[PDB]
Design a protein around this ligand. Structure first.
Ligand SMILES: C[C@H](Oc1ccc(-c2cn(C)cn2)cc1)C(=O)Nc1ncc(-c2ccc(Br)cc2)[nH]1
Ligand SMILES: C[C@H](Oc1ccc(-c2cn(C)cn2)cc1)C(=O)Nc1ncc(-c2ccc(Br)cc2)[nH]1
Ligand SMILES: C[C@H](Oc1ccc(-c2cn(C)cn2)cc1)C(=O)Nc1ncc(-c2ccc(Br)cc2)[nH]1
Ligand SMILES: C[C@H](Oc1ccc(-c2cn(C)cn2)cc1)C(=O)Nc1ncc(-c2ccc(Br)cc2)[nH]1
Ligand SMILES: O=c1[nH]cnc2c1ncn2[C@@H]1O[C@H](COP(=O)(O)O)[C@@H](O)[C@H]1O
Ligand SMILES: O=c1[nH]cnc2c1ncn2[C@@H]1O[C@H](COP(=O)(O)O)[C@@H](O)[C@H]1O
Ligand SMILES: O=c1[nH]cnc2c1ncn2[C@@H]1O[C@H](COP(=O)(O)O)[C@@H](O)[C@H]1O
Ligand SMILES: O=c1[nH]cnc2c1ncn2[C@@H]1O[C@H](COP(=O)(O)O)[C@@H](O)[C@H]1O
Lengths: 333, 333, 333, 333
């Protein structure tokens, strides 16, 4: 029998590693952190100066965040937990601040096609078909319909996935980028409520195995707690990282300051939390420390990435994606 | 020598995984959580609408719980820590509330045959031969005697086991279902007192390898803490889950509200605890948070299961039983 | 290269398991806990009714403990942190309480031969050559000298060891039992101070591989925290268990009651602690909860063992020594 | 696919062990701790009586520490976070206290060559080219330039490295010793900020595989918390250990006593901390317990090492470097 039980070796299909399971190995380097090139592909066509996108969540990204993110060289994805007219107006607001990149989330519900067309009319650059489970005909069909209808002017992202097969399906549907993350989010309770998930380093490695041969960038979404996690996600093969928790504490996120026991916080909640759905939960409502301006958070995050590129001899993100890991033990934390 | 010591490779026979060691992998799916079919076999003949049974414990299941459980589409197993006449009367009470399914525990002591016949007379549907260690001639003989005597009107469950061989023995004795769990219970101290046990995912996989080829359902009993654990136990191959801790906090369980430090609790104790035996302990007496009505707890539990069936593309429990896992590391919690 | 570094596969020689790493697997059984036979060989010649010996420590075993232990069916080993005359007088005191078995520790210092002869004269049954590191010519020579001089009337134990080779050396020197434990003691700081040790399940398996073929019993010494650990140590192949921590809280141990924050304690200290040596430390001075009479502690310990013998179908300790383990993961605790 | 994801087996290159992952196995021994020879090579030419060097940090080693360390039989490395004139004057101060060994850190910046020549003029014995990442042409060139210019009178150390290849590069550049440690320091945040590092036992094993064949000693730098860690680092093949945390609490380190909540502390900060750089941080500012005189700390540290040499039968450090480990599990701590 199989050492962990039963007679089927495929029952337990893999050993899933998360960020805390690995470290980047230093390598020969003539790259100074200050000189590394941090640009990377968000989608097949769109390159960002900084490989970071803010999550499509209503305690993270509305117009103010999208504007600050694009000015910092990344991009925001506007959340979709509001009327179609307001979302499109947020898109327009970002555009009124210059030639700034902006994305917007849509679902696959009755109302999604209308939403997508309104955002298109508003001048959106990227449409993110954004769902709990993208390995599904309705999601694949929406990705394909958008790519064939508005595809030559708008880039279309599909997510989220957690396996090589799911990512391959989005590639075949025409996705211009694939977003990876089922289970790892800081406010996510999918793992405890449904018992479902995939540790994020293994999920990225698997998705990249399906996406890289086709020139489709992977967006690592969820579970990033530290600047060093960004470096790890990219070295695992992702081209960008999507941040929720790390940006929800910033001045530019929606929400006000909360003072508890003399310290400053902001509210941060899952899109699957009770309160987000009353606008069986798979997300919580919580708080995160107030962090100040976005520009300052992004500076330290990018600083950590630059440090990693120095250590690994990576002049570009493309080079970082070829870096090697060491696996650590439980004693290692 | 063997890497862990000595010269015998069979000394340390396997690596045992528990619920926290695994996650369900998302898979291609056209199944909406709301549309999944949650029915499953309790025994060879009996199918439940909801794959959940309440434990035969005196702080969990008396008539009120059995009634609420059957109305929710599951079943209760009446505990046996009272006189034969009272247990049979509880059986009758459940039946007075309609054509509701109900089970009842018996042991293998002098008094067990009399108990079993009285419950039969009371109209019980399922008899559960329920013991700390079922891999034993007296237990096997009782299972067989019941199956040959009352077997065509009553289904007979045997438990508990933790190995492929033990489950195979119950199958050969005529069990209509096999119950798995030695060591994993929340109030169980078998692991620390006797040093005995089997991690529950590996125990289910092993028991299913013996039971499924013979069409005998496995009941996963003990160690379930979250709705996601129910999904994991079924995907490991079990057909139903038995709950103690998760239901002991409910309005319908025996026992009154306990107020400690401004919060509400109910008493929850092992059948092998001092107080359960004074009616060398292998169970504790504890408290669990008061949770309100059973209907509400079952709704969230079934909600979590439906979510898992959506993620895994499982239209039925039978399909869920073929789902795949990823193993996670210690960093994964 | 070797996956953990360097080019030498023998550098990291084995994966060491401790008690918490394993569980005993239930097996077919017709043995009732109440009926199991708990007797076992302390030495080649001496069998105990209960497979438990108290440590040769000055906060655990003086005459009162030795007397209580023998009456409970085990034995005490009198510590040697006092003058030769007092130790011998303690031996005599035990003998004045009937035909009770008693052992006594000696070292390998200048004074040890004199000590050994005085204890012999006092009527001691077992001499324990007791040292931090027995894999050493002076220890081997002392074991052999005693066996050739007083060996036909007194049994001679040697310890402590942690490897197959060390145990083999004591067997060749003539030891009648071998004591295993370098590093695992509750009050031991050898692991942090010297960086030396061996996880106790692997140490027992290795020592038994050297001792069992020669009919020499292994005494598992140190690291036992729960009654279930006793069962594990014996199933790993040991014939008896030596207890320090578990008995230091008892009425019969040396030392008085200590009241701290409304709860009762006794002092418990390593023989290598500062205070034991002032009569570079490798042991601490601590407290353990007061537990009451020895008889009560031994009853629960033996109760747990009986439970294990029931679960594993072990009618005798000899049978228990053939039981199988499952290895558990970090999530398993 | 590879069990942890993707199709490349080299992506995750190794399993990295840290000190807490291993223990030294006791071995046959005729070596008394008091009699072991603790001397070891700092560099190809320089042997120390005690295999310990103090870190080049401004809360650890200035003239007072360098003096105390050499008198204890080790050496100090003077930090370089001050003007060239003051560092050279510290070197001279040490020399005014007798024929004491002393080292000094230099970087690879514009000012480093001048620094190195001034320290040379001051009578320094060892120059340590000391950087976050030594696997780099500028570092290799500096090591080589120093070795060819002042190499016959001064020994030249290069660091830090974490891989076999990096250490091989320093050997080829002419290093007289190689210093190992990227990530493990107590005040280091490289792992969380950059996601970069190498567990220290595996890093030492790998570096030694490159250095030992060429007769170049390895200095184990960072992550040492206990005296037992020193023994482990040497048995892994290092010839000396560099200490920061363990010595920063001593009377001889720079800094004053800090009283917080009735207990005594000293400040201890990374050279990459904000405050060290304001003279994106990769080190913190913290406190360590005040420990008293250096002589006392070194005595217990050397005591622990002697204990390890006794247990492993190592008469010399060279013998200790051939000792074997056992790997432990997470339960092992
Ligand atoms: C609503 C609630 O919680 C959420 C909400 C949003 C996300 C989310 C992640 N991302 C990237 C974008 N949005 C995740 C969880 C929930 O339980 N959703 C849910 N659980 C299972 C399914 C399902 C699985 C198969 C199929 Br087919 C259809 C639905 N959906
Ligand atoms: C009474 C006490 O604690 C309990 C009580 C009930 C259960 C329990 C689980 N389940 C599913 C239904 N009931 C478990 C433990 C206890 O120690 N029992 C016990 N330990 C060993 C044996 C034994 C092992 C081999 C043989 Br053969 C006979 C008895 N029995
Ligand atoms: C005195 C201090 O602490 C102790 C004291 C007693 C025990 C102890 C266990 N047991 C079963 C019986 N007694 C263990 C540690 C200490 O450090 N002892 C020590 N550490 C290394 C050596 C050594 C190693 C090789 C050789 Br060869 C000679 C001595 N001795
Ligand atoms: C200044 C700050 O923090 C420090 C400061 C000193 C040390 C330190 C260790 N040791 C032994 C001696 N000094 C370590 C970290 C920092 O982030 N430094 C840094 N991170 C990446 C690079 C880099 C990587 C490739 C190349 Br090429 C050039 C620079 N440098
Ligand atoms: O309610 C939820 N349940 C599960 N995942 C969520 C939920 N809400 C947002 N997310 C995901 O979690 C990511 C943020 O993760 P974080 O950066 O670790 O906080 C988002 O970008 C989404 O992919
Ligand atoms: O005293 C005990 N010792 C060991 N297992 C028990 C005891 N009492 C009840 N159980 C088992 O534990 C299960 C409940 O586990 P739980 O749902 O994790 O709380 C029951 O259904 C029984 O199988
Ligand atoms: O000071 C010490 N250092 C290391 N081991 C000790 C020391 N003192 C007693 N012991 C060992 O530890 C055992 C007790 O371990 P315990 O039962 O876990 O508390 C004794 O029987 C000795 O083998
Ligand atoms: O700011 C820093 N970041 C990373 N490593 C540092 C820093 N400052 C000092 N070190 C390293 O950490 C070592 C001390 O580690 P410790 O002995 O564990 O405290 C030093 O000898 C340096 O190699």
């Amino acid at each position: 029998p199989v050492p962990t039980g039963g007679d089927d070796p495929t029952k337990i299909a893999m050993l899933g590693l998360t960020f805390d399971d690995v470290l980047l190995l230093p390598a020969a380097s003539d790259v100074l952190p200050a000189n590394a090139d941090t640009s990377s592909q968000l989608t097949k066509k769109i390159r960002l100066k900084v490989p970071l996108v803010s999550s499509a969540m209503d305690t993270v990204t509305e117009a103010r965040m999208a504007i600050a993110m694009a000015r910092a060289g990344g991009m925001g994805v506007l959340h979709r937990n509001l009327p179609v007219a307001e979302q499109a107006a947020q898109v327009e607001t970002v555009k009124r601040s210059g030639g700034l990149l902006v994305g917007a989330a849509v679902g696959v519900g009755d109302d999604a096609w209308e939403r997508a067309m309104a955002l298109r009319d508003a001048g959106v650059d990227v449409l993110v078909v954004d769902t709990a489970h993208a390995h599904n005909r309705k999601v694949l069909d929406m990705v394909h319909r958008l790519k064939t209808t508005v595809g030559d002017e708008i880039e279309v992202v599909g997510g989220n996935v957690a396996t090589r097969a799911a990512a391959a399906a989005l590639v075949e549907a025409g996705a211009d980028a694939v977003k990876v993350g089922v289970g790892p989010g800081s406010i996510c309770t999918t793992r405890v409520v449904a018992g479902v998930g995939a540790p994020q380093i293994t999920a990225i490695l698997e998705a990249v195995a399906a996406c890289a041969p086709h020139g489709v960038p992977v967006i690592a979404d969820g579970g990033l707690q530290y600047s060093g996690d960004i470096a790890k996600a990219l070295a695992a093969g992702a081209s960008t990282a999507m941040l929720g928790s790390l940006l929800a504490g910033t001045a530019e996120s929606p929400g006000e300051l909360i003072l508890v026991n003399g310290k400053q916080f902001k509210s941060y909640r899952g899109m699957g939390s009770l309160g987000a759905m009353q606008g069986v939960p798979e997300g919580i409502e919580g708080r995160v420390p107030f962090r100040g301006p976005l520009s300052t958070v992004i500076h330290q995050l990018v600083g950590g990435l630059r440090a990693a590129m120095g250590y690994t001899g990576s002049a570009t993100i493309e080079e970082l994606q070829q870096a090697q890991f060491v696996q650590i033990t439980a004693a290692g934390l």
